[PDB]
Amino acid sequence: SERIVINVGGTRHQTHRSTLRTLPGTRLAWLAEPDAHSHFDYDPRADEFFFDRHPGVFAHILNYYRTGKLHCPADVCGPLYEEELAFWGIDETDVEPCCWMTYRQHRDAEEALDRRWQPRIWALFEDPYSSRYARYVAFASLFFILVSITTFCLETHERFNPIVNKTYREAETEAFLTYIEGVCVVWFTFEFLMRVIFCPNKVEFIKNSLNIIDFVAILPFYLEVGLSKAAKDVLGFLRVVRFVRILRIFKLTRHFVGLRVLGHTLRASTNEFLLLIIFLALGVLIFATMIYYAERIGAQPNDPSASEHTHFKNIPIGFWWAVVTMTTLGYGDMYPQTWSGMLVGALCALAGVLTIAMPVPVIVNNFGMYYSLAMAKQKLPKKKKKHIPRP
Amino acid sequence: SERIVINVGGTRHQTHRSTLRTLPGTRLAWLAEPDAHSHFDYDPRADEFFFDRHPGVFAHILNYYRTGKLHCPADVCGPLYEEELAFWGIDETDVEPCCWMTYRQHRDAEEALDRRWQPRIWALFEDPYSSRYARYVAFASLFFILVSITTFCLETHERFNPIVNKTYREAETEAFLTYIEGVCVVWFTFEFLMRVIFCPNKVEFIKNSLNIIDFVAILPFYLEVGLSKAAKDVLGFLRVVRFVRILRIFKLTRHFVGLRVLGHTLRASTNEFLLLIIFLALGVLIFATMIYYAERIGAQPNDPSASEHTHFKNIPIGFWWAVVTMTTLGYGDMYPQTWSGMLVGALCALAGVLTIAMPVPVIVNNFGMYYSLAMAKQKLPKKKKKHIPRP
């Protein structure tokens, strides 16, 4: 009596009917019942119920029945144990906190990492490797984005902005830059019109941040025809809009893998970012106050102002110094010049190293896990599902 | 004879009675005795004693009986093995040092991470999410703490401290800052009085560092009425007391999780902090002496003073340079200017990188373990104890 033998994959597990009967509703509980013989695969010759499952983990499942705490066996992958306890009826949200982080790891990484001529029209936006025209158009858009960025960076230069003797006198940009900008705008407008030709699910097309960036970047040049008092303000904000013209590089870099992994890492490590920002804000505030007060101890009594010989004339300046010093950057534009100031400075450097090295390793481990998983899923050749499951 | 078969969870373990008899007082030892049959669950049909326990770890327990050294099986969580050996009677302080740190890990992290209208009065200090009035009062205290801190930081500024032509002539602060400070003091005194209304266990309320900070921060303004020769000294120390007014931000940030984890990490990594401070002190002293002597080799014989062309006129200046250089901060206010000085400087930079990267990774690993455990225990939904233990 009350002696039941479970045969799992050829390994006989023995236990009392009470231990099975503890956790109700689960399959083993139904086993403990008196009418189990009829319902299950039970042979009267050996008085053992036979289950065709991995025995090495059924040990741990039955252990959950015995003691009362479910743990993850550290010798099997999380998904294997997940599938086994799913079969046995155990809820996965019961595992002890000692095992939860190792267990729910692959599934977290996986979850985070996850009209006739219209195909030919849309073939200019598909992946470059998906065709030959696609790769050609991709190379061309790469060339033109790079040309736009170089024109921008050279337009801000002095050599290309001489000031003419024209009378108000201001520097003017060379015509060649404006011509190259016009060419790039013509090409980008052609691409944008071709991509507007076919726009399925136009709501998501407008919600697509890349097309938003494209349109905002192409707005300032096109506004040359549209553009006197309001015109000055709109030109002033048009410079700020043009400022985004460097953001067209994400159009090219979106097809990279490391960047998608970085996006997933950022989106999945919000808590650690908030933690880092809070740590830095507290450190900056405290050390700015401390250095501002330390540097006033040695202030000369002659000068009317409280601080004349110190860079730390107030606390916000302390904020700047504290950031530069905690990140071990150390420009040297402002540094302590009093023994008290030097003590506070040494404390700031050490505390900065520590409170920067606290959450950054968490973020780095997240990126490492996501990058390894993405590189694996990329490397692994497409499978043909060799295992034909039985009916 | 001397052949005993232990049946643990359906797996038959065989061993000699002598091996069991080695370690006395334990349950298996009692098994080895001649009257075990009567006391234990022994069936004469198979001459095997039956224990309803995990067999995969009973292997390792019996191994401790056999060889004489207790180890932790690396395929089970520390708590699972802890509970198993606790059942078998093995003392947990016997495990070999090769296994102690992996074993006693979760339990270390866990240990470190651990009248009618009076409920409505006290509801202003409970958690914000615990009510609606609570969250409102929390937002209001947040606004007022931030306003106090901004008033402080702007009060130390020059733009808000013009010097009037009043005759002694000193800069005076604008009235608007004093008015905002008065408002914030009124609000904080109202909060403090409401929280004094109900003060259970007043000894711990006074021992509560947060209320201490609150009272010390509210003392200087209230002392305006209380406050001639002693008055100058008390004002001088009152500025230093006001210096703490930035510490009211911990009142808000105490409810954050990362900060509690950081507090536990600090309190649990005292040894590594002392190690870091000793390493830095030795490095600073040695390299200050070395650079001070190196920079004198090339001293010009003309100048009467020993050092005129070097920033390293003495050793304490060496302390400052050595800290700035070992933390890879490198302000550039003082740097070596002699080939010997440059050799010593390169040695200082490398030795600083090394003796800073020695203990900091230990501290970082501590924080990582505590943060993962705290985030797990926060994420895991409240359990309902599905396992109804048998009587």
Added chain:
Amino acid sequence: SERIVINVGGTRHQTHRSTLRTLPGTRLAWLAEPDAHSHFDYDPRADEFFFDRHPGVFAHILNYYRTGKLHCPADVCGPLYEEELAFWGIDETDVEPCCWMTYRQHRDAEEALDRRWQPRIWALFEDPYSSRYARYVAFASLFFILVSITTFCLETHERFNPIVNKTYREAETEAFLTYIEGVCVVWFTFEFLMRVIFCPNKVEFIKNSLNIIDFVAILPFYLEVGLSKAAKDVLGFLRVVRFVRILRIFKLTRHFVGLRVLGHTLRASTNEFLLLIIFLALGVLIFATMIYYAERIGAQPNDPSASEHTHFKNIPIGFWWAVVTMTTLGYGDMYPQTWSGMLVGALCALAGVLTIAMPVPVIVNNFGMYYSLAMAKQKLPKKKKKHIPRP
């Protein structure tokens, strides 16, 4: 019926013939067939097939048959499991992505880490420890390479380049340096001729980068006889060729182990290098643009130029500052001087720390694995293959 017992190394595994029959072509599939008895080692007494293999992993192989997903048992080394599944017929490219990176790890590291007087002639290029003459010649070439490098570094100095009153007036190098260079060239030409005497597989000898470096380094001196208008250009490029004379140190350092491990790490971490370069390029571009525009907000309206008080007169200067600031180098030649500029600067420092600490740990882990494996394979004494395999 449909009940088959597999005996693997004395452990009886039981399963249905259907589960074996799922995955076809594999050995167990052939077992499931009706004529298995004749073909395999089957004894009718126990109706069990006997396989002389590790049972602890046959559990996981049969689990692949049962569920349909192949995993790596985390309690056995990758090569052990590799050999077991190779025996059983399972393809190794079926393991789940959760296990692929741990599994295919040692094999990745291993793959990356992998006429009578002519022996006496060639003995001057073999390993130094391979003979006594070899070690002597190696020491001599070490001395002469070091002498060449020191002559170069002193030749570029001022103390050794006085300007004589000879009439055009230019500084000339001392004769002693030219004599030492001549001596070193004589020795290197003797070595190179002796090594040309015996040159098996001359195609790979010319493809050998070390000999290429040797010949390019020995070309400029020998060109003294060969060398008026073209002569000036060839001397100008000859200085640039001489620039390589420091590269002869790799001839000596090639026999070091850490350097070969570093070469293998570099060649095996191309993807992470491209990732680091893309991250740095995006960060540099974005932050250069941001700081250039931030620093113009506070520009004084008096000056005709857009920026007079800021170091950030254009964007490329921003590139330089952004690199120096993201690597936490912080020279201090250029730094923000406007509250907006300081905000952008703090963002640059933090983003640089983060996007530098993203891929560098991946690269560091690669080097650590390769270095541990190389040091192991070096330390382990040469084996004598104690296991005489059975026929």
Added chain:
Amino acid sequence: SERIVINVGGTRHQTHRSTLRTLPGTRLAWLAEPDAHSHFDYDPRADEFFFDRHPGVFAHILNYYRTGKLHCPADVCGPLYEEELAFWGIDETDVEPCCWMTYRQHRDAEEALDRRWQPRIWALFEDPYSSRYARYVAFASLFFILVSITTFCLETHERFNPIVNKTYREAETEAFLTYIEGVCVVWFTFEFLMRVIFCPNKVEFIKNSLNIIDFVAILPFYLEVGLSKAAKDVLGFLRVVRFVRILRIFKLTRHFVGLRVLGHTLRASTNEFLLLIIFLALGVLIFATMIYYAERIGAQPNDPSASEHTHFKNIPIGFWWAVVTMTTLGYGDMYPQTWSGMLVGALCALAGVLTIAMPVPVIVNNFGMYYSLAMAKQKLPKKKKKHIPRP
């Protein structure tokens, strides 16, 4: 025939006599022989040999017999497997390189971490906690070492070295410093004489570096009586000897644990230190040459000297800049000022980060392992060897 059943700890392992017979000389080989029955514990009832050992690892030992490669089971501590294979007769130097580093880890860390009134005389040098007089004398020597160090550091100061109007005119040190030095010398000489009173194994006492440092530090003061032409040279070298007076702090810090762990780490990581020094030397040389040549591209043709506007007037200056820049120190005393120089500078910063982060993590992991093991062995309470081994 050729079917042998090994019973290890109640688990029946089955294999062919040939597989056992492969590896000769080992215990299992002797089992395979025809006269094994008489020699071993064999019962004819079940035709199984019984061994009272852990079965979970005998699986892997028999696997070595089967396949031919010995691996470490990743689910047992290295010492447990070591003892098991030691019992079975397997040589420990056979494990595959995939397992060698995990296996030989604890044993590496452990190996690296390892007349009547004469007891009362020597009690002044024993551990402080070993008595009360011992702790008192230790505190007193601490006070006096600290006083000596402070006297030294203040003696090098300007405030304590005024120059008197005595006629040659040089600064002289105050008498109070000389008096304090005399007091400290009296105390140290008393300690040294008391410790010379009892000097067992005087060869090792003289080889003891601490006593060497003590005697060298006490020599200069005592030489006041001993000390005209040679006297100036001996005073000049006496200043350099006094330079060691800061080394008396190791006398106190030797009893610390972290410092002994650091000493063991250094002594056990010589290879990685040599690797770091070689990496830094190659980087410094290459980047010094590169920056010196890059900065000359933009040299103005007017100046007679090759370089007038650049800090990089020669290559050794390049060595200094390259160290300061690769360690991300960045003083700012010298920095590139040409677009080519800036390119080379960015390369130097990145290459420095990389080739510094290559071996330093290896060294850091060594220190972490040694520190964890030492802290464990310190924490663990003294055992009483509960396991009374059987005869």
